[PDB]
Design a binder for these strands. Sequence first.
DNA 1: TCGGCTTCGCGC
DNA 2: TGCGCGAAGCCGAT
Length: 456
Amino acid sequence: PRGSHMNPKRIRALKSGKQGDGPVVYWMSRDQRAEDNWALLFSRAIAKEANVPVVVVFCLTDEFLEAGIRQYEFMLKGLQELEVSLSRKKIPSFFLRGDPGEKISRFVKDYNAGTLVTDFSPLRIKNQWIEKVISGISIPFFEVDAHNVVPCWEASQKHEYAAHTFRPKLYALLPEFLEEFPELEPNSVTPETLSDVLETGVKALLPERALLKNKDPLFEPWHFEPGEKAAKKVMESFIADRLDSYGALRNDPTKNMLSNLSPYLHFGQISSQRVVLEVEKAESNPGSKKAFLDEILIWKEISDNFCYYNPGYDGFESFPSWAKESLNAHRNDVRSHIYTLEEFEAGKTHDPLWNASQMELLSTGKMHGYTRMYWAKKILEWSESPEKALEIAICLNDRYELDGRDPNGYAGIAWSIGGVHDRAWGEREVTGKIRYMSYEGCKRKFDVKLYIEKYS
DNA sequence: TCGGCTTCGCGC
DNA sequence: TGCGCGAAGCCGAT
Ligand SMILES: Cc1cc2nc3c(=O)[nH]c(=O)nc-3n(C[C@H](O)[C@H](O)[C@H](O)COP(=O)(O)OP(=O)(O)OC[C@H]3O[C@@H](n4cnc5c(N)ncnc54)[C@H](O)[C@@H]3O)c2cc1C
């Protein structure tokens, strides 16, 4: 649909129909940003072709009640900065509240929309909203992959088993899809308050907060400043200060050598393609550049491939055949320890390293990547059943992680607990053939003592 | 029908 | 600290 620096493989028609005479509505959801947004840039191209304005809509769902203050305040503060950014380009933003299956369908008919466009997300709750809006509208409905560099439906046509089967497929399409972004043109035709949704949003989640003994809450919101502008600063500080020694200090949680980009990448406050653009042009360690590109391109986009082609990505059914047979054969094995969800949540286990990992999760909202594997694997070893292990790990992840409720989370937890995108290993107690990670293995990799004392 | 796929453990 | 190095399945160029 028109344009030259616009790859049509990023667009796919979700429903046919006659193009209305009204404005193009962009149902933004996953990629909350003004710049470097294919879904917003595509909506402008269709809007410019029909001589209609482009409008952005956002439907705040009732699923923030399963997500606390740390994820609500991080999202809402970025939406307030986004509203000012879109207003500078004369693009109005409308913020709705309720079921998107009924609010979006009511919004298009009331505003007399001509074409509806939205971003891509492989989550189950998004596929239900889409089908509910297709049966309630009469205008064409388009969908853009603005999160992945290579469109999810174009990178692979099936669920990829491991990373070595997905790496040559992704890198073969890189010269075509890795491109610069055109500047968002402003509107030529101008035609709820967020401060109130934030006040009414926190007061409902105040009782469900994580507090210490003296009613002192555990979350430290000064570690990550939300917003599109702040997300660019974290990227700039990563390339100049942390990219050189990233390839060597990536498995050391005592060194702040990660990009710290996942909270902005999950909420779409920064484009992963823009990060790859700047990383590919920077002169750093070739081992560190290949190590970082392999995380934000291969592992990040294979998680979308895992959730898009496996509807039960958060269940035991999505595990490989060799894993399910191994975990079922070790269901009657005697567990050395058994902890409930409340014991895992408060970090009241016998392992000081695991408790230190959980304390970093509760206090900073972003637990180190290497400790996240030790964190989720110890849950499987100290639980009643593999089904309970998956339930506790997903619950604690999507509640305190700033990057929670993300395909990277479900695919990461499935990698540690169900061996997805991995292979079998030494046969062991309880965990069977799933890869085991011990306290002593982390002691030789990094100063474990420094990690415990930092988080009690 | 082999090949070498990490974010492993553990011994120089 | 790098470097080996067993121990286990299923994919993919054949
Ligand atoms: C049990 C478990 C749970 C996780 N929970 C989440 C989660 O809820 N949300 C989330 O976005 N990621 C999660 N991760 C992936 C990974 O832990 C985080 O991406 C990473 O820790 C975030 O910090 P970073 O961006 O500074 O890491 P970096 O080394 O700087 O990587 C940058 C980006 O690459 C991506 N990435 C890196 N590693 C992975 C990976 N193993 N899988 C998928 N993407 C990756 C991330 O998007 C990340 O933002 C989880 C992994 C595991 C094993």
